[PDB]
Structure 1
Amino acid sequence: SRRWFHPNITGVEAENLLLTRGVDGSFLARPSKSNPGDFTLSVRRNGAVTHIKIQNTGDYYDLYGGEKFATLAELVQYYMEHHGQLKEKNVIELKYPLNCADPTSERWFHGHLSGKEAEKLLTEKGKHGSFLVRESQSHPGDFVLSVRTGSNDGKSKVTHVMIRCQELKYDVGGGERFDSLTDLVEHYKKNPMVETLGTVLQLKQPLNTTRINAAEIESRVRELSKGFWEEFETLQQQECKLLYSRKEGQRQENKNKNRYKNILPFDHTRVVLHDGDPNEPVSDYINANIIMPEKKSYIATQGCLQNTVNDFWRMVFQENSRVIVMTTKEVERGKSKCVKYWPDEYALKEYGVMRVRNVKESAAHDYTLRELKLSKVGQGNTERTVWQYHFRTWPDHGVPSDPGGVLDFLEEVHHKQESIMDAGPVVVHCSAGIGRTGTFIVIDILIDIIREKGVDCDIDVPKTIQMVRSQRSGMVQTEAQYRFIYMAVQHYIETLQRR
C-alpha cells in the first residue's frame, strides 16, 4: 500500500536499505529524479541488489523486462501475486516491501508550520475531525498533531498533541512507539485519543490544501512553479485506495481485446455491451470505462485493435455517443497506437452489424474533423451523425509547452457536444486510454465548472483527478500532464478575464 515507495531516496541509499534492513525478495520503488517519468524498482536477490528501470512518457508505466501498467501500485500487486513472472535479461522475486518512514507525501503532513498559523487554517478550512501534523518550533526534531473538534460560537476547538521523536521512533508521550508518523497517525486514526473530560480526538480527514478559487490560479501556479512535483506525488500516494477489481478484463475470452494485458477496466464502471453475436463466447466486453464527473459524461477507452473495431462501433451506437475525441496519431514512433476504424472521406464501410459513412473531413492546424454517419445495418431510422475530432500534433513524448491549441480544440469539442439534444457520453481515446485520455477529460471537467460558475468558483485539481482515477485505472499518467492541467485552466481563465 505504497509504503514501498520512497520519494526522496538516492540509489546508494536504496541499496544500503535493502542490504541492511531487507532480505532476498525485499524491494522498493523510487523516482530517478533527474528525468521525471523515470522510476526505479530496486530488488534484493541472492545477496545482491538489482535496479530495474520504469519509464513513463505519458501513456503507461513501462517496466524494462516486464509489462506495462497503469499505476505503480497495480504493477506491484501484479508481481506480488505472480512469482517468476519478472526476470532480468539473461527470475526476480518481489516478496517483501521495504517501508519508507518519509511523511512528505501524506496529505496530513504540512512540515513547515507554526501553531497559530496551523490554528487559523483549521479555523478557516477545517471541520470536526480535521487534522494535520507539523514540526514543533519549540522542540527541534519533534512534531505536533493539531485537530479540530466540536459561526465562531465556541462550539468547536483546536487541540495540539505533542509528538516526541526519540531514537528514530515517534510517540505521544506514552504507550506505543512507532517507526514513522504514518504508523502513529494510522493507529490513533483507528484508536482515537480521548481527553480526560471525554473529547474524542478523532482524525477523520486531513486539512484540504489543494482547493483554490479559480480567480487566483495564477497565484497557485506561480507558487507551485518553485511545488507541482510534491503535489503530484502526494496524489500518487493515494492510488493504493483504488485497486478495484478488473476481473472481466482478466477473463481468458477477453485477453485478446486488451491492447495492454494488464491495463484493464474496473468492473464497476466498465462499458457493458448488449445485443451481441450469440456464437461469440463473451460478447459484452470492451476495454472502456464510463467516467461521470462527481451533466456531460465520458467514455475513456483504448485505441481500437483490428479485432475490436466492431466492438467500438457497438459501443458508440449503444451509448448514443455523438462525439469522439482521438488524442493520438494512428502510428507514433513506428508503433500502432490506434487502428483506423473510420472510412476514407466519401466512403462507406460496414463494421459487423454497424455501418459508417465518412461524409466530410475538415483539416484544421492541429486537428481534423470527420463527419461520420453511423447506423445499424438493415435498420433505417437508426442513422445518427458522430463527430470525430482527431488531434494530430500532440508530441510523441511529454506534453505541449503551450496549451492554446488543446484549448481551442477542447472548446470546439464542447460546443459540438452541447449542440446535440440528448447526446450520450463523449468518447475519448489514446493508446492505452489512461494518459492523454485522462488528461483531456480532467481539463474538460475543470473547465466546465468555470463555464457554468464563472471565474470566481472553487476548483481542486488533485481531488478531481482522484475521482476520475476511481473510475478508470491511472487516469493522468505523469507530473508533466499534471502541470499541463494547471497551465491549461490558467490559460482558459486568462482569456476569459480578458473578453
Structure 2
Amino acid sequence: SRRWFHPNITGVEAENLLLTRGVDGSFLARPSKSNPGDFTLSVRRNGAVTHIKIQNTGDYYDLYGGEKFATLAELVQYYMEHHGQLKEKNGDVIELKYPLNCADPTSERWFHGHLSGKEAEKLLTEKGKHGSFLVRESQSHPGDFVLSVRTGDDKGESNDGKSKVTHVMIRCQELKYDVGGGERFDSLTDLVEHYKKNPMVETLGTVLQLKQPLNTTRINAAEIESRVRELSKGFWEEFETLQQQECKLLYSRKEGQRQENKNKNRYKNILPFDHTRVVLHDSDYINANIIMPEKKSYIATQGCLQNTVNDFWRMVFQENSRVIVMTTKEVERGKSKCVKYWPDEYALKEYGVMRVRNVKESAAHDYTLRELKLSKVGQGNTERTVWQYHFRTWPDHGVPSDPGGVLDFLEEVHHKQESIMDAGPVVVHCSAGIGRTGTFIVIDILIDIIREKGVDCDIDVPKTIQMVRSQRSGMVQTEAQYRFIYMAVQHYIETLQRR
C-alpha cells in the first residue's frame, strides 16, 4: 500500500537500502530525478540491484520492457500477481516479493511538519471536526513530533466548550517513535496507524479518535494567487501527498479483463472501473467511465481503435451526448493515439447502425470544431447535432506553458453544452483517456464551481482529483498536469476579476 514508494530517495541511496535492509525480491519505487516525470523501479535480485525505468510523459506509466499502467499502485499490484511477467532483456524473470517500506512521513495527509502550535490549534479550531488530527514537528523539543487531535460535538468555531484540542508528545528516541510509553514504532506512519486501531484513552475516559486528517488544501478561490505563490517557493509535497492516496483506489476492473474485451483496450492494463464503466445495451463493453462531480457529467474514454469506432458511436448515441472533447492529435511522437472516427468535411459515413455527417469544420487558433449530425440507421428522426472540439496545440511532452488557450477552449465547450437542454455527458478523450482527459475534466469541474458560486467560494484541487480518480484509474497523471490545474484556475480567477 504505497509504503514501497520513496518520494525523496536517490538512485544510489536506494541501492544501499536494498543491499543492507533488503533481500532478493525486495523492491521500491522512487521518483527518479533523471527526468522529472520519470520513475524508477529498483529491485534487488541475485545479490545486486537492477533499476527498471518507468516513463510518464502524461498519458500513462510506461514500464520500460514492461507494460503501461494507470497508476504505480496498479503497476505494482499487477506484477505481484503475474509472476514471470516482469522480464529483463534476456528473458530472465524479475520477482517483486518484499515491499521495502519507506519511513518518510512527508506524503501522509496527516503530517504537516513546518507548523507552530498556535497555528495547529487555529486550524483544528476553524477547519476541524470530531476526530480531526495532525502530526507536526515540535519546536519546543526538536526532532520530536506532536499529535494534535480534536474531539467533541460539532465542527467549526464554538464557545459551548463541548469540543477540545488534546496534544500528545511523540518522542524520537534512537530512530523509533513513541507516545511516552508502550510500544516503540519504526516510523510515524506505523505509530499513527496503531493509534487509529487502538485509540489512546484519557484518564477520565476521553477516547482520542484519529478519524480523519485535517484539511489544509481547501482554499478560498478568491485567494488562490497567494496560495499558489506559497506553493511555488509545496506543489510537490501536496502532489505526492495526493499520490499516496491512490492505494485506496484499487477497485475491480473485471469486465475489461475478460477475453472478449481485451482487444477493445488501447492499452491492455489501463481499464475502466466496473462500478462506473459505461455499459452499452445497444457486446456491452467500451473502455470508458462516467465521471460525476460529487449537474454536468463526463464520459472519459480512450482514443478509439479501428474496431471500437462503432461502439464509441453507440455510446454517444445511448448517452445522449452532444459534445465531444478530443485532446490529442491522431498521431504523436511516432505512435498512434486515436484513429479518425469522424467523416471528412461534408462527407457522410456509417459506423455500424450509426450514421454521422460532418456538416461543417471551423478552425480556431488552438482547436478545430466539427459540427456532426448523428443518427441511427433506418430511423431518420433521431438526428441530433454533436459538436466535436478537437484541441490541437497540446505539446507532445509536458503541458502548455500558459493556460489561456485551454481556458478559452473550455469556456466554449461549456457554452455549447449549456445551450443544449437535452445534452448528456460531455465525452472527453485523449490516448489512454486518463492524463490529459483527467486534466481537462478537473479544470472544467473547478471552473464550473467558480462560474456558479463566484470568486468567494471554496475549492479543493487534490480533493477534486481524488474524487475523479475514484471514478476512473489515474485521472490526472503528472505533477506538471497538477500545477497546470492550479495555474488554469488562477488565470481564470483574475480574468473574472478583470471582466
Could you state the TM-score of these two structures normalised by the residue count of structure 2? 0.97
Query: Could you tell me how far apart the structure 2 residues matched to 1:319 and 1:308 are?
Result: 16
SS of the aligned residue for 1:378 comes to coil
User: Identity of paired residues, percent?
Assistant: 100
SS of the aligned residue for 1:482 comes to helix
Query: Could you tell me how far apart the structure 1 residues matched to 2:138 and 2:409 are?
Result: 49
Q: CA deviation at 1:276?
A: 5.3
Deviations 1:133-172 (A, max 9, x none): 01122222211101011x2221111111111111211111
SS of the aligned residue for 2:228 comes to helix
Q: Which runs of 5+ in 2 are unaligned?
A: 152-157
Q: CA deviation at 1:114?
A: 2.1
Query: Could you tell me how far apart the structure 2 residues matched to 1:155 and 1:111 are?
Result: 28
Q: CA RMSD in A?
A: 0.9
Deviations 1:177-228 (A, max 9, x none): 1111111101111111110100100001111110000001110111111121
Alpha carbons 2:25, 2:97 under 8 Å: kept: yes
Query: Could you tell me how far apart the structure 2 residues matched to 1:50 and 1:152 are?
Result: 59
Query: Could you tell me how far apart the structure 2 residues matched to 1:362 and 1:120 are?
Result: 54
Query: Could you tell me how far apart the structure 2 residues matched to 1:224 and 1:139 are?
Result: 27
Q: CA deviation at 1:275?
A: 2.4
Query: Could you tell me how far apart the structure 2 residues matched to 1:127 and 1:134 are?
Result: 18
SS of the aligned residue for 2:255 comes to coil
Q: CA deviation at 1:347?
A: 0.4
Q: CA deviation at 1:115?
A: 1.8
SS of the aligned residue for 1:52 comes to strand
Deviations 1:284-321 (A, max 9, x none): x0000000001000000000000000000000000000
Query: Could you tell me how far apart the structure 2 residues matched to 1:315 and 1:97 are?
Result: 41
Alpha carbons 2:27, 2:41 under 8 Å: kept: yes
Q: CA deviation at 1:116?
A: 2.1
Q: CA deviation at 1:418?
A: 0.3
Q: CA deviation at 1:106?
A: 0.7
Query: Could you tell me how far apart the structure 1 residues matched to 2:283 and 2:378 are?
Result: 16
Query: Could you tell me how far apart the structure 1 residues matched to 2:83 and 2:305 are?
Result: 30
SS of the aligned residue for 1:201 comes to coil
Query: Could you tell me how far apart the structure 2 residues matched to 1:194 and 1:250 are?
Result: 47
Alpha carbons 2:68, 2:267 under 8 Å: kept: yes
Return 107-116 or 36-45, whichever deviates more: 107-116
Return 54-63 or 135-144, whichever deviates more: 135-144
Q: CA deviation at 1:260?
A: 0.3
Query: Could you tell me how far apart the structure 1 residues matched to 2:481 and 2:301 are?
Result: 18
Query: Could you tell me how far apart the structure 2 residues matched to 1:312 and 1:98 are?
Result: 42
* Stretches (4+) displaced over 4 A: none
SS of the aligned residue for 2:286 comes to coil
Query: Could you tell me how far apart the structure 2 residues matched to 1:444 and 1:152 are?
Result: 40
Change in 2 beyond 3 A, CA 1:276/1:68: closer
Alignment of 1:422-437 (within 5 A): 422-437=422-437
2:101 to 88, 99, 102: 99
1:113 to 106, 112, 115: 115
Could you state the TM-score of these two structures normalised by the residue count of structure 1? 0.97
Deviations 1:415-474 (A, max 9, x none): 000000121000000000000000000000000000100111000000000000000000
| Count of aligned positions | 491
Query: Could you tell me how far apart the structure 1 residues matched to 2:192 and 2:159 are?
Result: 28
Q: CA deviation at 1:399?
A: 0.2
Deviations 1:88-124 (A, max 9, x none): 2121111110000100001111112222221111111
Return 242-251 or 222-231, whichever deviates more: 222-231
1:142 equivalent to 2:149? Answer no
Q: Which runs of 5+ in 1 are unaligned?
A: 278-284
Partner of 1:126: 128
SS of the aligned residue for 1:463 comes to helix
Q: CA deviation at 1:12?
A: 1.5
Query: Could you tell me how far apart the structure 1 residues matched to 2:475 and 2:281 are?
Result: 26
Deviations 1:320-356 (A, max 9, x none): 0000000001111121100000000010000001000
Alignment of 1:277-292 (within 5 A): 285-292=285-292
SS of the aligned residue for 1:287 comes to strand
SS of the aligned residue for 1:456 comes to coil
SS of the aligned residue for 1:307 comes to helix
Query: Could you tell me how far apart the structure 1 residues matched to 2:159 and 2:266 are?
Result: 56
Q: CA deviation at 1:125?
A: 1.2
Query: Could you tell me how far apart the structure 2 residues matched to 1:334 and 1:50 are?
Result: 29
Partner of 1:448: 448
Query: Could you tell me how far apart the structure 2 residues matched to 1:140 and 1:333 are?
Result: 51
Q: CA deviation at 1:380?
A: 2.1
1:264 equivalent to 2:266? Answer no
Q: CA deviation at 1:34?
A: 4.9
2:258 to 242, 248, 251: 251
Deviations 1:46-100 (A, max 9, x none): 0110011111111001111101100000000000001110112121111110000
Alpha carbons 2:282, 2:318 under 8 Å: kept: no
Deviations 1:362-386 (A, max 9, x none): 0111111000000000012111000
